[PDB]
Amino acid sequence: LTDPIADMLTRIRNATRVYKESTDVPASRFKEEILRILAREGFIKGYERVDVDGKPYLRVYLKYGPRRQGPDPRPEQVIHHIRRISKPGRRVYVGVKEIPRVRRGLGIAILSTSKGVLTDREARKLGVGGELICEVW
Amino acid sequence: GRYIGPVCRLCRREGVKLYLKGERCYSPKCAMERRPYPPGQHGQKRARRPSDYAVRLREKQKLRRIYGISERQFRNLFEEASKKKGVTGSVFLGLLESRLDNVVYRLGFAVSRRQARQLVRHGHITVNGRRVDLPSYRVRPGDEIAVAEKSRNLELIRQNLEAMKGRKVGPWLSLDVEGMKGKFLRLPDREDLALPVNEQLVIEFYSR
Amino acid sequence: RNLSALKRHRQSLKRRLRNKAKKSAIKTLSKKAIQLAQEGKAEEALKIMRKAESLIDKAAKGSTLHKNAAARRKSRLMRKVRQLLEAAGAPLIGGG
Amino acid sequence: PTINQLVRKGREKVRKKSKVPALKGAPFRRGVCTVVRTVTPKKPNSALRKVAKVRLTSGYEVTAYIPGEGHNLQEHSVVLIRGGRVKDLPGVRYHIVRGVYDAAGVKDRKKSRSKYGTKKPK
Amino acid sequence: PKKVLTGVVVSDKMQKTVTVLVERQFPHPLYGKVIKRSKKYLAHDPEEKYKLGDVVEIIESRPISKRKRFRVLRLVESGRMDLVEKYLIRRQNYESLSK
Amino acid sequence: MVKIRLARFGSKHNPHYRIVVTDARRKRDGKYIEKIGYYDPRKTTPDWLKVDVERARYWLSVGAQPTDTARRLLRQAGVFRQ
RNA sequence: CCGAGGGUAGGGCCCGUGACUGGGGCGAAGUCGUAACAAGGUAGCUGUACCGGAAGGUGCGGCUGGAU
RNA sequence: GCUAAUCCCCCAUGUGGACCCGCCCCUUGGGGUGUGUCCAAAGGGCUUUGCCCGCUUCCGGAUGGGCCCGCGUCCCAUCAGCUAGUUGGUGGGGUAAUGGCCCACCAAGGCGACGACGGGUAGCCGGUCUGAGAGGAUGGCCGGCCACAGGGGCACUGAGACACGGGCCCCACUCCUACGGGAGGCAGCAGUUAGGAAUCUUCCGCAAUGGGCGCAAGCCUGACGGAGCGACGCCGCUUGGAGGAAGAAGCCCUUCGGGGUGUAAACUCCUGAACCCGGGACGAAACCCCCGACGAGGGGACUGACGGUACCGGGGUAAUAGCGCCGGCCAACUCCGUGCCAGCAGCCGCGGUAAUACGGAGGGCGCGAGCGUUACCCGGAUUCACUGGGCGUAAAGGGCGUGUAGGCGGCCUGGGGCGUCCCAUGUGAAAGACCACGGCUCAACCGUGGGGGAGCGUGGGAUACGCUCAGGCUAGACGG
Numbered sequence A: 001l002t003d004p005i006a007d008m009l010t011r012i013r014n015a016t017r018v019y020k021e022s023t024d025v026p027a028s029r030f031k032e033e034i035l036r037i038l039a040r041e042g043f044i045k046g047y048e049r050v051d052v053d054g055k056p057y058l059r060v061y062l063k064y065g066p067r068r069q070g071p072d073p074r075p076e077q078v079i080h081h082i083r084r085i086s087k088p089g090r091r092v093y094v095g096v097k098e099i100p101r102v103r104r105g106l107g108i109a110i111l112s113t114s115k116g117v118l119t120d121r122e123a124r125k126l127g128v129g130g131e132l133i134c135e136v137w
Numbered sequence B: 001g002r003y004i005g006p007v008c009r010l011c012r013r014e015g016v017k018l019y020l021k022g023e024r025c026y027s028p029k030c031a032m033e034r035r036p037y038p039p040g041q042h043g044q045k046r047a048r049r050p051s052d053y054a055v056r057l058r059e060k061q062k063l064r065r066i067y068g069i070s071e072r073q074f075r076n077l078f079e080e081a082s083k084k085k086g087v088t089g090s091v092f093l094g095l096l097e098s099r100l101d102n103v104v105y106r107l108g109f110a111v112s113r114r115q116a117r118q119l120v121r122h123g124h125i126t127v128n129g130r131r132v133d134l135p136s137y138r139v140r141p142g143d144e145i146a147v148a149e150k151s152r153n154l155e156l157i158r159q160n161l162e163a164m165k166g167r168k169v170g171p172w173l174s175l176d177v178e179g180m181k182g183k184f185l186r187l188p189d190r191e192d193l194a195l196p197v198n199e200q201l202v203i204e205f206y207s208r
Numbered sequence C: 001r002n003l004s005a006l007k008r009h010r011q012s013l014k015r016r017l018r019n020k021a022k023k024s025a026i027k028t029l030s031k032k033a034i035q036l037a038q039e040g041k042a043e044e045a046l047k048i049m050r051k052a053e054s055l056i057d058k059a060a061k062g063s064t065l066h067k068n069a070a071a072r073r074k075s076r077l078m079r080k081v082r083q084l085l086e087a088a089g090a091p092l093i094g095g096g
Numbered sequence D: 001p002t003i004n005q006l007v008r009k010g011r012e013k014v015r016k017k018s019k020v021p022a023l024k025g026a027p028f029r030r031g032v033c034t035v036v037r038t039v040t041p042k043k044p045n046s047a048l049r050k051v052a053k054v055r056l057t058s059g060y061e062v063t064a065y066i067p068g069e070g071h072n073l074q075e076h077s078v079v080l081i082r083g084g085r086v087k088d089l090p091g092v093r094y095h096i097v098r099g100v101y102d103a104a105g106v107k108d109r110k111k112s113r114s115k116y117g118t119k120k121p122k
Numbered sequence E: 001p002k003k004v005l006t007g008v009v010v011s012d013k014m015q016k017t018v019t020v021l022v023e024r025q026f027p028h029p030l031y032g033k034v035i036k037r038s039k040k041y042l043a044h045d046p047e048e049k050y051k052l053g054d055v056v057e058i059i060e061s062r063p064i065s066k067r068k069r070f071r072v073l074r075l076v077e078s079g080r081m082d083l084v085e086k087y088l089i090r091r092q093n094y095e096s097l098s099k
Numbered sequence F: 001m002v003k004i005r006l007a008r009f010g011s012k013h014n015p016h017y018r019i020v021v022t023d024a025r026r027k028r029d030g031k032y033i034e035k036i037g038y039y040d041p042r043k044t045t046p047d048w049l050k051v052d053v054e055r056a057r058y059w060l061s062v063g064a065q066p067t068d069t070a071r072r073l074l075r076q077a078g079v080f081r082q
Numbered sequence G: 001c002c003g004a005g006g007g008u009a010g011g012g013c014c015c016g017u018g019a020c021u022g023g024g025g026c027g028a029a030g031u032c033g034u035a036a037c038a039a040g041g042u043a044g045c046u047g048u049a050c051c052g053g054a055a056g057g058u059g060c061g062g063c064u065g066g067a068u
Numbered sequence H: 001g002c003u004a005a006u007c008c009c010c011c012a013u014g015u016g017g018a019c020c021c022g023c024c025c026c027u028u029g030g031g032g033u034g035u036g037u038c039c040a041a042a043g044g045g046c047u048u049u050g051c052c053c054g055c056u057u058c059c060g061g062a063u064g065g066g067c068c069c070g071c072g073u074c075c076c077a078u079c080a081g082c083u084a085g086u087u088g089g090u091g092g093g094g095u096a097a098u099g100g101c102c103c104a105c106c107a108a109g110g111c112g113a114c115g116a117c118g119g120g121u122a123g124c125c126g127g128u129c130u131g132a133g134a135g136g137a138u139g140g141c142c143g144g145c146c147a148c149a150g151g152g153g154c155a156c157u158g159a160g161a162c163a164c165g166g167g168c169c170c171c172a173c174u175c176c177u178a179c180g181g182g183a184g185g186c187a188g189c190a191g192u193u194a195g196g197a198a199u200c201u202u203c204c205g206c207a208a209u210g211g212g213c214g215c216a217a218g219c220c221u222g223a224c225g226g227a228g229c230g231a232c233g234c235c236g237c238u239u240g241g242a243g244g245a246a247g248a249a250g251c252c253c254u255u256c257g258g259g260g261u262g263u264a265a266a267c268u269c270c271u272g273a274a275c276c277c278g279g280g281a282c283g284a285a286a287c288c289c290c291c292g293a294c295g296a297g298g299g300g301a302c303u304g305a306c307g308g309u310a311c312c313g314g315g316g317u318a319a320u321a322g323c324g325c326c327g328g329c330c331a332a333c334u335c336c337g338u339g340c341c342a343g344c345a346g347c348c349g350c351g352g353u354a355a356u357a358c359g360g361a362g363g364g365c366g367c368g369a370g371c372g373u374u375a376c377c378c379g380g381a382u383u384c385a386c387u388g389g390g391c392g393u394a395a396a397g398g399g400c401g402u403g404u405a406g407g408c409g410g411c412c413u414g415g416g417g418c419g420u421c422c423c424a425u426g427u428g429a430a431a432g433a434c435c436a437c438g439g440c441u442c443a444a445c446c447g448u449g450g451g452g453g454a455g456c457g458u459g460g461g462a463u464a465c466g467c468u469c470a471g472g473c474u475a476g477a478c479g480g
């Protein structure tokens, strides 16, 4: 594996398209900090440190919409969209003043900064920029 | 300069009465009140559905043909309104209104803007004292638009003031009759005039 | 078909003349001093070196040599002469 | 391509090719007619189009079209040209400007006279 | 201030002079990605104290010769032949890039 | 030498000078060192003159030379009042 | 001493042009056959080789983008 | 062959400065000091025991420059290897000064796929044009820098030049003569000519601003301030305005009943571009004179190319319209004529006897002293795709491995803090642009003010991620 972070976001995105109750990602002290923001901003029901075959994992409990009317009774997503911004191929750095407003306000840009993992809102609050991790809505 | 031609053919194309003459406009000898159909050999032929473009051409031509103004100056104002803060439609309409020849016609000094121009053009008008012969002058709030006294004692101004005793003039305008002098109070809200023009469509014309 | 620039040209020829005349004498003496300083003749070496040194700074007063050129020239004159005299010696005058 | 592939080779700025080489940068070029004749056009048309061979001041010699009904062009006639092909006449990439030099305007034009170099009648 | 760069000595075949290879990173103006670029400087070493593989600092200086505009500042590290290899192999590969 | 003089701006039959410190060898409307005031000979505005008298004295102190018709605009601006 | 340049000699790159010649494009109302599209009347296409007025044919191996 | 000086040289004095040797601080040749040595100078004018302008030597300031470094700056790899002053050293030469800039010698190096070398094109920037932005294109005018002065080389004088209207030499060209000999350098303002699609008056003025010289009066100023010309561009304005037939003639259409041009005209009143007369600038108050003290200050006067123009006041005539288009895109439709002809054409396509597509007419549309065309730039083009594209059959996976450089890389804990982010700070000239106000009667144009950013130098700060160093783990990988 070459991008641990992206893999997680992809594990989540894929798992939500079939409405899994939960899903497992290989653990990391940085993946957690991200997952923390993901839970507080209300994208996921939460997470917990599990083990798979003696190996550390993070189990993520997925959150969806209500049962729906019509031919497609599939509920809406809570995470409609999640994808890497910065990459190993190309590191994306933004100063505070150039931090983008995800979906006119309805979504967040998770960012890694020299003052912890913050959202776009929090970055302007704390007054710092950094590597743009991903955007989610 | 301006259009300077047969003016009733305009209204007949627009499908609306544009009150471009003054007196004759209200008479039943009006072009529209006799023939409400387009000028020329094919005016009575049953019209086919006007293209999306056609609709916006007309509305711009309408608003422009109202003011008897050249397309350049029309364009330039629109642009100035396109850069300037706020609802572009409002600022454009206001700027078109703030023209001296228009203010002169609005305060009732003349029967037609066409006539209102020559009054400005021939020095018969003044602002805050000084004489102005420029139909394009940008009227601001606080401008005292008066008739030059050397032009006060003239028939054509009298006849036209003799109609301005009790005619009410917009919420943005004041007037002192007899003394032949009025004032521009503020920029006309879109509410202040009910011109036969959906000005949103004018913006959309220029966005091509 | 003419100016006072022709006048300005004329002056240059005379100043060139006076310039070349001083600078040659310097080189002639400086080497003369250096000459003696090798086969010292320590007195005669220093004796000439003074006359060269003098002519250097006297040319420096005018448009001949710039201040730093005279200084540059002198620094090289003394250094060569003394070290020439460091073989055998010994400096019979000043100097120094 | 990968981002890396872009850093290495970059993108390729593709140039435009002039359609009027004989002009050599200019808006118009003066020439002299060598041959003045008629040429049959390609399908699906059929006619006798009026065409001139002109040798330019750019050193070039190109074939030029003669617009309008009738003309006063002949050998040695001095002529000015402008751009624009005549699709149906392969090898014709230029039009002769009427009303310039030895090229007179069209007799009896009333509509669109500027494009046919005809003075306004009284 | 007088510009100071850190680089590896890749040649000591000159007398009183060494070649100091300095590297640098920066985001590509259009493409964002962080890219590496390097440049060789000929540096003045009056005592010939520095060896092949020494990671050193150089300061910009008054002209010493042609092409020599830097003097060596200080020894930073000794014995990084692993870097000289990276440099040398690239040069060697050039004999396989010809025709 | 370094000087303080008027560099014409404005337009044709519409003079408008900027008082300024710049090299005598400069072209008049050329690059200057620092602007230290403005001036309108046509007097079309309430204050057709103004001068940073604080600054205009600094350069003067260090060897700047004013033009004659600038000395006027500097005296009137009270730089020469002792 | 170096030196603008001139001169002698031999190289390199480019441009223009040349009897004649190779194919290419368009023109089209000519000539010859009918190779391809249907199982196109010998399934086609293919690399290569040899052959023939011309499309093409055939050998060898390959593909199905082949009908039945 | 005579002669003066602020021309030139000699001695002196040495505040000081210059040099070698020594030494203290400093740290590249910075500052101080001691011995030795070396170095100055010019007088002129008025009101005359006093001023003014000068002159000499030295220190500092300010301003304008030289040189050096980091990063940034187009196309071709069908240019892949380049290099003997070449790379470095020692010692000199040279300069204001560093330097192979130059010489001698010694070493054998220097550069190159991060594109050397070679070829092609281009003066670079502030900015300009376009574009939602990113980006693309561009460098005319105005400002900054460079380079050049018929083609080349060289130095002289000088603070500064290797000097557009200074010098020498070679070349090409042209010219002049008395045929014996000599001269020139408009890429300065005008102007001529050739070239070309094409680009201006052999004008006026030093009154204004700036510049050179002088104590000053003042003199010079094709810089400049203006004028002339050209719709080349932008902007303002004009060819009128009100009234005026169920509607003249003319012409077009027609079902022959009528429909159109069209309130358009005619005609009525009203105004008054042009023009005629009168007055007539802002731009010009300095220098200078007077007193004061030649200063501070106060008081006096001279001068306007534009120009009797603008403009203000009086009189006063209804007074230029053109160009493109009307098949679809794309706004505007009918008749005649032609008959795959003549012709139109940006693309699709029109015309072979019923053409809104050709030519003419009427009518209509769009702009308007302009309208159209050609050429080029950007846009539409998300059609080189960073923003923001693709590769089973549409154009596109290399025939397959192995591997160099390069690119990218698992979990944990530390140190560094390079990337990265924050703050402070300097720079980011002016003009342009953006916002506000103001001056021309408006605008164009122009003045005053305001907001800034990138990017780099500097100091301080942070440590999540990328980096680096260090120590661990076993999920990847490999081995038994």
Ligand code: SF4
Binding pocket: B007, B008, B011, B012, B016, B017, B018, B019, B020, B021, B022, B024, B025, B026, B029, B030, B031, B032, B033
């Ligand atoms: S009369 Fe006035 S309103 Fe009636 S048509 Fe003629 S112009 Fe329009």
Ligand SMILES: [Mg+2]
Binding pocket: none
């Ligand atoms: Mg992105």
Ligand SMILES: [Mg+2]
Binding pocket: none
């Ligand atoms: Mg106009």
Ligand SMILES: [Mg+2]
Binding pocket: B018, B019, B020
């Ligand atoms: Mg109305």
Ligand SMILES: [Mg+2]
Binding pocket: B081, B082, B083, B084, B085, B086, B087, B088
């Ligand atoms: Mg707006």
Ligand SMILES: [Mg+2]
Binding pocket: B170
């Ligand atoms: Mg009302």
Ligand SMILES: [Mg+2]
Binding pocket: B206, B207, B208
């Ligand atoms: Mg637009």
Ligand SMILES: [Mg+2]
Binding pocket: C004, C007
């Ligand atoms: Mg003289």
Ligand SMILES: [Mg+2]
Binding pocket: C028
């Ligand atoms: Mg001699």
Ligand SMILES: [Mg+2]
Binding pocket: C063, C064
């Ligand atoms: Mg000299």
Ligand SMILES: [Mg+2]
Binding pocket: C060, C061, C062, C063, C064, C065, C066, C067
């Ligand atoms: Mg000197």
Ligand SMILES: [Mg+2]
Binding pocket: D031, D032
């Ligand atoms: Mg010719």
Ligand SMILES: [Mg+2]
Binding pocket: D044, D045, D046, H340
């Ligand atoms: Mg046809």
Ligand SMILES: [Mg+2]
Binding pocket: D083, D084, D085
């Ligand atoms: Mg064309």
Ligand SMILES: [Mg+2]
Binding pocket: D110, D111, D112, D113, H324
């Ligand atoms: Mg026409």
Ligand SMILES: [Mg+2]
Binding pocket: E064, E065
């Ligand atoms: Mg050296």
